[PDB]
Write an enzyme that holds these catalytic residues in place. Structure first.
Site, short mmCIF file in Angstrom:
data_model
loop_
_atom_site.label_atom_id
_atom_site.label_comp_id
_atom_site.label_asym_id
_atom_site.label_seq_id
_atom_site.Cartn_x
_atom_site.Cartn_y
_atom_site.Cartn_z
N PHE B 217 2.05 14.49 -2.28
CA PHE B 217 2.42 14.04 -3.63
C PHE B 217 2.27 15.25 -4.55
O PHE B 217 1.41 15.27 -5.42
CB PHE B 217 1.48 12.93 -4.11
CG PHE B 217 1.38 11.76 -3.18
CD1 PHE B 217 2.28 10.71 -3.26
CD2 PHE B 217 0.37 11.71 -2.22
CE1 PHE B 217 2.19 9.62 -2.41
CE2 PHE B 217 0.27 10.63 -1.37
CZ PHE B 217 1.18 9.58 -1.46
N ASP B 238 6.59 15.63 -1.03
CA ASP B 238 6.95 14.66 -2.07
C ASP B 238 8.19 13.92 -1.57
O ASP B 238 8.95 14.44 -0.75
CB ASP B 238 7.25 15.37 -3.41
CG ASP B 238 6.92 14.50 -4.63
OD1 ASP B 238 5.80 14.64 -5.18
OD2 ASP B 238 7.78 13.67 -5.03
N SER B 239 8.39 12.70 -2.05
CA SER B 239 9.54 11.91 -1.63
C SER B 239 10.75 12.17 -2.52
O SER B 239 11.85 11.66 -2.26
CB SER B 239 9.16 10.44 -1.67
OG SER B 239 8.62 10.11 -2.93
N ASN B 265 8.14 10.99 3.34
CA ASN B 265 7.32 9.84 2.96
C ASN B 265 5.89 10.19 3.41
O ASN B 265 5.62 10.33 4.61
CB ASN B 265 7.85 8.59 3.68
CG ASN B 265 6.91 7.41 3.57
OD1 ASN B 265 5.81 7.42 4.11
ND2 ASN B 265 7.35 6.37 2.86
N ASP B 286 -2.64 13.29 -4.42
CA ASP B 286 -2.49 12.92 -5.82
C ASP B 286 -1.59 11.70 -5.91
O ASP B 286 -0.53 11.74 -6.52
CB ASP B 286 -1.90 14.08 -6.62
CG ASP B 286 -2.03 13.89 -8.13
OD1 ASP B 286 -2.63 12.88 -8.57
OD2 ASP B 286 -1.52 14.76 -8.87
N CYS B 326 -5.12 8.06 -10.41
CA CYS B 326 -4.91 8.05 -11.85
C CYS B 326 -4.64 6.64 -12.35
O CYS B 326 -4.14 6.45 -13.46
CB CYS B 326 -3.74 8.97 -12.19
SG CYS B 326 -2.19 8.45 -11.44
#
Lengths: 377, 382
Positions: B217, B238-239, B265, B286, B326
């Site tokens: 991520f 990252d996707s 993924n 993340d 987050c």
């Protein structure tokens, strides 16, 4: 020989907790020592063992190894290694070199006070290895004191005594901490609050209140930024050491004050006294899961009062070193206090134990220190 | 003009939470604005108010003021003042100047990207005060953009629009962060490639060195950029191709050829990497909130656990794990509980290296739980 534990013991060691108690031990040697732990035929770990204690198994390796003594000493080496950087740069500081379970060295604690080390063995198997420990530390100390006089050792079936292990052990030593120095009577503050005391040096103001000052470690650092610091404690002996440390630093703005914290605080409030900063470094209020209940209320009361004594914009540095006071409860307690005091607190910083007092996520009990700084808006 | 609330509402404001919802409001103005809040005859606070929203009361002062607007603006001044030091020292950096409730300025967010500020309002009353907001900013800024296009503004019955407030707003800006720089996209309808609340956490990662580092991520690759300085190879995952696109761009902008993107993924790639027997020196997770509501915690927890579990399994003995969350819903206690379960299930001992959260420019209020959402933790796998 070897140790055999039930499924529950196996699970605990599988989840990587270092402790297995009596009730989960199926069989094992009749003499304390270092032995492999087994679940049936499956190897689980190497550990310190004691056949006469509730806490019978203390793992220090989850991997087999020829010569268990050698492996334990490896762990020791690695522990000291993790602290080499600092002992080089700050030879006169105070740091813990071995933090029991946290350093995978159950039953062994070793602290460094500006060149003089104090060893504390609490597991039967460390008793005959001290010479080895001394030999391991030697490269960094000028003294080594076996301070093995803790009641916890009786439970293990060990003798109580304080005897030099290497070199000439002073009666007292001066430790450098940031911009201040304090006296350590190697025979009789605590290093886990070292970095938190230093943090306090970033604040300045008129008046600072240091509740539960002990040898006034926090006071010393605060005296550098405040016109007046009032160190409070119930022990004359403590405040005596506080004045002495104050003088050792040529600080005349530090005023000791023998008193009962809970009462004094209610008092400063009723009299309308107010401060720019209040430190709360209470001693563990709980001696067991039982006390948690009452402990919680004790912390709330003090914290509540402390908050009520702070001026708008004042700083609150509150803490807890109790094992039974979990971090979540601790912060819940501070919040309740803030709420009841109808005052808004901004988080300035949440802190804990420093790098030299390692915490293991899988072994909750290694985490006991909570230190937080808030600003009252 | 007054606002009357029941005992429940009063209690909340007494305990110093800044929010009072519709259900606890007895009476109040017919138009949005700034008004005093009372429990009977008892004064409680000054607040932004909206007659048409579930969240009706957003307090910003628990003491009477004769001019509600003046008081709100003083709050603004003090918020900017708390960032004065850094704006001078690091004029090229990225910092949040106003963090809504945390700065006692509900419904207002303002970020600073190397001289260019972006304003975001999401509570009615702030709309007519925008001009004065750009004013207080003027001395510290080169330009001020008003990015008012968040769906939340529709609940408030406000228009969605992006438009300059002061000066010439660049379409892109370069922000300096420690020993690295990255691109922030201010163009209308574009994602600000910056996530300022992770600024100090990225910087922290500069203390590590090693062979391979995995950045799950990675978004615009902020963590990747900092890691690239201490590891031979960094794999940003990252996707989003768009994201990895900006990641490669930020990489080039820094003259880093050791950063390799990888569209994929996360959940699957992690399992795969285990099977092919891939182990790294450090890994970072993340994850984007997995809870669009305090009812998804259940499933979310499981989600975090699986990924953390996998991440741990991919780490070398002595490797570093930097994981985070987050999401407001994933509470700190829960987060640490889930990391622990993960470590336990993976039969691996984790030593805490450091527990971190939001930086000083993203204030947290103890009495207002919702202002606390970022959890960032560093562990060492023994």
């Amino acid at each position: 020989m070897r140790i055999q534990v039930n499924a529950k013991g196996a699970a605990r060691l599988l989840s990587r907790h270092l402790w297995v108690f009596r009730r989960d031990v199926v069989s094992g040697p009749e003499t304390p020592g270092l032995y492999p732990v087994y679940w049936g035929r499956r190897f689980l770990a190497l550990a310190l063992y004691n056949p006469h204690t509730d806490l019978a198994v203390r793992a220090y390796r989850f991997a087999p190894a020829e010569d268990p003594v050698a492996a334990l000493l490896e762990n020791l080496a690695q522990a000291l290694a993790r602290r080499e950087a600092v002992l080089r740069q700050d030879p006169e500081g105070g740091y813990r070199l071995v933090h029991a379970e946290g350093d995978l060295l159950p039953g062994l604690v070793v602290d460094y006070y500006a060149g003089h080390a104090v060893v504390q063995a609490t597991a039967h198997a460390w008793e005959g290895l001290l010479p080895q420990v001394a030999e391991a530390l030697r490269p960094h100390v000028q003294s080594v004191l076996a301070k093995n006089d803790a009641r916890t050792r009786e439970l293990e079936g060990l003798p109580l005594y304080v005897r030099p292990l290497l070199g000439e052990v002073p009666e007292r030593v001066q430790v450098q901490e940031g911009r201040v120095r304090y006296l350590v009577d190697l025979r009789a503050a605590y290093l886990d609050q070292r970095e938190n005391r230093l943090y306090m040096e970033r604040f300045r103001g008129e008046r600072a209140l240091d509740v539960f000052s002990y040898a006034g470690g926090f006071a010393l650092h605060l005296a550098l930024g405040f016109r007046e610091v009032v160190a409070v404690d119930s022990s004359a002996e403590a405040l005596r050491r506080a004045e002495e440390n104050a003088r050792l630093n040529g600080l005349g703005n530090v005023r000791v004050l023998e008193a009962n914290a809970f009462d004094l605080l209610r008092r400063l409030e009723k009299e309308g006294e107010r401060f720019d900063l209040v430190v709360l470094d209470p001693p563990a209020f709980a001696k067991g899961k039982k006390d948690v209940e009452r402990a919680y209320r004790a912390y709330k009361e003090v914290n509540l009062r402390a908050i009520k004594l702070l001026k708008e914009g004042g700083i609150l540095a509150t803490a807890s070193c109790s094992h039974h006071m979990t971090e979540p409860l601790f912060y819940a307690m501070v919040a309740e206090a803030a709420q009841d005091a109808h005052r808004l607190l901004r988080v300035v910083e949440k802190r804990g134990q420093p790098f030299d007092h390692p915490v293991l996520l899988n072994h909750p009990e290694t985490h006991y220190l909570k230190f937080a700084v808030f600003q009252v808006l």
